[PDB]
Amino acid sequence: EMVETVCGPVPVEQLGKTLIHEHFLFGYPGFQGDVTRGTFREDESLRVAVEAAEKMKRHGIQTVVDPTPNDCGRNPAFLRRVAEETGLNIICATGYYYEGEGAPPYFQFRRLLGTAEDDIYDMFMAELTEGIADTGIKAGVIKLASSKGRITEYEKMFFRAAARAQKETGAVIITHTQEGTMGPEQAAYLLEHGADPKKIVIGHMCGNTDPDYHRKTLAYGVYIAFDRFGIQGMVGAPTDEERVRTLLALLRDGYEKQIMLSHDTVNVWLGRPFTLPEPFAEMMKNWHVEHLFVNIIPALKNEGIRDEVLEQMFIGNPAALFSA
Amino acid sequence: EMVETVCGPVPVEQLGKTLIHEHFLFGYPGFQGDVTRGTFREDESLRVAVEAAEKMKRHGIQTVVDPTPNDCGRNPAFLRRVAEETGLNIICATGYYYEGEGAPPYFQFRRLLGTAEDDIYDMFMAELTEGIADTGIKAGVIKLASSKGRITEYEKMFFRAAARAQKETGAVIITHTQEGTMGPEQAAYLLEHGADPKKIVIGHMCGNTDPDYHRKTLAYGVYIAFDRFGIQGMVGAPTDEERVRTLLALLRDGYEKQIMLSHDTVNVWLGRPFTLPEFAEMMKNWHVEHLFVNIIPALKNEGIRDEVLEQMFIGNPAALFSA
Ligand SMILES: [Co+2]
Ligand SMILES: [Co+2]
Ligand SMILES: [Co+2]
Ligand SMILES: [Co+2]
Known part of the structure; x- marks a missing residue:
C-alpha cells in the first residue's frame, strides 16, 4: 500500500489528484555534447520546476509521475529538491527511451557481448528496490518505449526485462507509443511475458484518433493515457480537438476506469535553448501544466462529462494503479 | 606557432613524439543511463589513465591527441588531471560521433528547428576559441565521423560546419572512418567546402587493406592515420599483419610525410565493466605500448629507416599543427 517517491515511501491512498506523465527536466540524447552553449543552470532550472509544481498545486494536484528515461537526462536528486520545496509527491522511472530517439549504442554493444537483457533487468531491480x-x-x-510501427529487437530486451522485474516487485509499467502505433502490441507482448495488465x-x-484502436488496447485490461494534451502539429500529434473527440467516445462507452490524462510537458529543456517557428509555436501555445485544468476539463464538462468521471480518472485510477 | 592543449597553449615545436589517436576515457552513448551499476570511479580511472600515460612516456611519447567525441563521454577536466600528473601534452577534440553509434537525436531535433548546422558551427567555434x-x-x-559506406545527412552537417570553422580558425580536423569506408569521400567533401588538406x-x-584506396585518399594531399594497431576481430577490423602489409606498400611509394600511426586505445571504459569472450586473444595487443614493442620492430625488420619513423611520429604532427 506504499509507492516509492523521490522523497521515499508514500501511502498510495495519499497520492490524491495525479498527473500521470509530465517531465520537470528532459533532454534528447546528445544534449550532453552541447554542454558549452547548453549548460544546465541549477538555480534557474529549480526556480522554473518549482513554479511548474506550484501551478499544478493550484489546481489540486498532489502527485506527478515523471517518467523521464535514464538516457534522456533523468535527475532524481533534482526532482527531490522540487518535492522538498513544494510538498508535491513526485514518482520517477527506471527505463530507456525508444530506439529512434534514445541512446541505443551502449546496450546494443552489451547485446553483442551477450549480457544486455540481464544487465537491464539488474538495473531495473537495483533502481526499484535499492x-x-x-x-x-x-x-x-518502469518506463518502456517502442518505435513507429514496431517494437524493435533492442526495445524488446527492455520489455522482457520489465515484465520480469514487474513479476518480482509488483512495479507499475508506464509506456511511450510512437505516433499512435503499437498500443495493442505492447499490451499483448507484456502480458505474454507475464506482466499484470x-x-x-x-x-x-x-496519438491515435481511431477509437477502435483504443478499444483493441483496452480489451487487454490495461490502462491507457491521453497524456499529450497541448502538443499539436509536432511529433506527428493530432489536435486537442481530435484528442477530445476520441476521449469522449471512450468515456461514453464506459471506459473511465482505464483512462488517465496528462500533458507530457517538458518544463526545463536540457541542452541549448530554442524557439519553435511561428508555424509550430502558435500550435504549441497550450503545452503547459495548467492546460488540462484551464481548457480541457472545461471542454469536457461542456460536453456533459461529470465530476465523478473526472475524479475517477485523476484520483481513483492512479490509486488503483499503484495498489496491489 | 601554438596549439591548444588541456593545459593551455603549447608551442607546436615542443610537441615532440606524438600518438595521434588514443582515448583515456570513452563510453558508448547510453552509458549515462546505466549509472547505478556502471559508476564512474574517478580515483581508479585516474590511476589507470596516468599509468597508460606513463607507459607512453617510457617510449618517448610527449603528446597525445585524444579525439573522444562530445557525445561519447569527453571529459577535458579529467584529461587535464592526467596531464598535470604526468607532464604529457594532451590535445582534445570538439565533435560528435558517427550516426550509427553516436547520439543523433539532439541535433536531429535542432535540424527540424532549422538551426542545427549553424548551432554545430557555433559549438565548434566556442570550443576552439573560447x-x-x-x-x-x-x-x-575538430573530430568528424562517418558511417559504413555513407556520410549521412546528419553527419554532413558536421562536415560542413567543420570546414567553415577550419576556414575561420585554421583548426586541425581528425576523422573516424567506419569499417574501411569513405576515406576518399571525406577528403573530397571537406575540400569541396574549402577545408585545407x-x-x-x-x-x-x-581498416582497409587495398593500397589503391589509400592512394585515392592520399591524392587529396591529406594525412591518413593507421590508428587502430592492436584491434583485431572486432569492429570489422583487419589483422595487424594486414595493416603492416598495407603500410609497407605506402612507405615503399614514399608517402611517409602523409602517414601517422596510433592504437585508438580506450584506457578506461565508461559504464559497466565487461569482458570479451575467447576474441579476447585476438585483442590482446590493444594497448599503448604495442606500436613500440611490436609494430615498429617489425617495420625495422623490413628495413624501414629511423628517419621515416621519426617523420611519422614527430615530423608529421609538427607539420599538421603548424600554419
Ligand atoms: Co514519450
Ligand atoms: Co514523456
Ligand atoms: Co573512431
Ligand atoms: Co577513437
Whole structure:
C-alpha cells in the first residue's frame, strides 16, 4: 500500500489528484555534447520546476509521475529538491527511451557481448528496490518505449526485462507509443511475458484518433493515457480537438476506469535553448501544466462529462494503479 | 606557432613524439543511463589513465591527441588531471560521433528547428576559441565521423560546419572512418567546402587493406592515420599483419610525410565493466605500448629507416599543427 517517491515511501491512498506523465527536466540524447552553449543552470532550472509544481498545486494536484528515461537526462536528486520545496509527491522511472530517439549504442554493444537483457533487468531491480546511483531514491515505475510501427529487437530486451522485474516487485509499467502505433502490441507482448495488465499504462494513446484502436488496447485490461494534451502539429500529434473527440467516445462507452490524462510537458529543456517557428509555436501555445485544468476539463464538462468521471480518472485510477 | 592543449597553449615545436589517436576515457552513448551499476570511479580511472600515460612516456611519447567525441563521454577536466600528473601534452577534440553509434537525436531535433548546422558551427567555434563548458580548456582539433559506406545527412552537417570553422580558425580536423569506408569521400567533401588538406587527418585508414584506396585518399594531399594497431576481430577490423602489409606498400611509394600511426586505445571504459569472450586473444595487443614493442620492430625488420619513423611520429604532427 506504499509507492516509492523521490522523497521515499508514500501511502498510495495519499497520492490524491495525479498527473500521470509530465517531465520537470528532459533532454534528447546528445544534449550532453552541447554542454558549452547548453549548460544546465541549477538555480534557474529549480526556480522554473518549482513554479511548474506550484501551478499544478493550484489546481489540486498532489502527485506527478515523471517518467523521464535514464538516457534522456533523468535527475532524481533534482526532482527531490522540487518535492522538498513544494510538498508535491513526485514518482520517477527506471527505463530507456525508444530506439529512434534514445541512446541505443551502449546496450546494443552489451547485446553483442551477450549480457544486455540481464544487465537491464539488474538495473531495473537495483533502481526499484535499492536506489538510483547515490541518491537513495527508488524508482516507482518502469518506463518502456517502442518505435513507429514496431517494437524493435533492442526495445524488446527492455520489455522482457520489465515484465520480469514487474513479476518480482509488483512495479507499475508506464509506456511511450510512437505516433499512435503499437498500443495493442505492447499490451499483448507484456502480458505474454507475464506482466499484470492492472499494473500497465499504455502511453501516448491520444496519438491515435481511431477509437477502435483504443478499444483493441483496452480489451487487454490495461490502462491507457491521453497524456499529450497541448502538443499539436509536432511529433506527428493530432489536435486537442481530435484528442477530445476520441476521449469522449471512450468515456461514453464506459471506459473511465482505464483512462488517465496528462500533458507530457517538458518544463526545463536540457541542452541549448530554442524557439519553435511561428508555424509550430502558435500550435504549441497550450503545452503547459495548467492546460488540462484551464481548457480541457472545461471542454469536457461542456460536453456533459461529470465530476465523478473526472475524479475517477485523476484520483481513483492512479490509486488503483499503484495498489496491489 | 601554438596549439591548444588541456593545459593551455603549447608551442607546436615542443610537441615532440606524438600518438595521434588514443582515448583515456570513452563510453558508448547510453552509458549515462546505466549509472547505478556502471559508476564512474574517478580515483581508479585516474590511476589507470596516468599509468597508460606513463607507459607512453617510457617510449618517448610527449603528446597525445585524444579525439573522444562530445557525445561519447569527453571529459577535458579529467584529461587535464592526467596531464598535470604526468607532464604529457594532451590535445582534445570538439565533435560528435558517427550516426550509427553516436547520439543523433539532439541535433536531429535542432535540424527540424532549422538551426542545427549553424548551432554545430557555433559549438565548434566556442570550443576552439573560447573554452569548453566552464573548464577554460580549448579543443585543439575538430573530430568528424562517418558511417559504413555513407556520410549521412546528419553527419554532413558536421562536415560542413567543420570546414567553415577550419576556414575561420585554421583548426586541425581528425576523422573516424567506419569499417574501411569513405576515406576518399571525406577528403573530397571537406575540400569541396574549402577545408585545407594539410590540416586534415583521415582516420582508421588501416581498416582497409587495398593500397589503391589509400592512394585515392592520399591524392587529396591529406594525412591518413593507421590508428587502430592492436584491434583485431572486432569492429570489422583487419589483422595487424594486414595493416603492416598495407603500410609497407605506402612507405615503399614514399608517402611517409602523409602517414601517422596510433592504437585508438580506450584506457578506461565508461559504464559497466565487461569482458570479451575467447576474441579476447585476438585483442590482446590493444594497448599503448604495442606500436613500440611490436609494430615498429617489425617495420625495422623490413628495413624501414629511423628517419621515416621519426617523420611519422614527430615530423608529421609538427607539420599538421603548424600554419
Ligand atoms: Co514519450
Ligand atoms: Co514523456
Ligand atoms: Co573512431
Ligand atoms: Co577513437
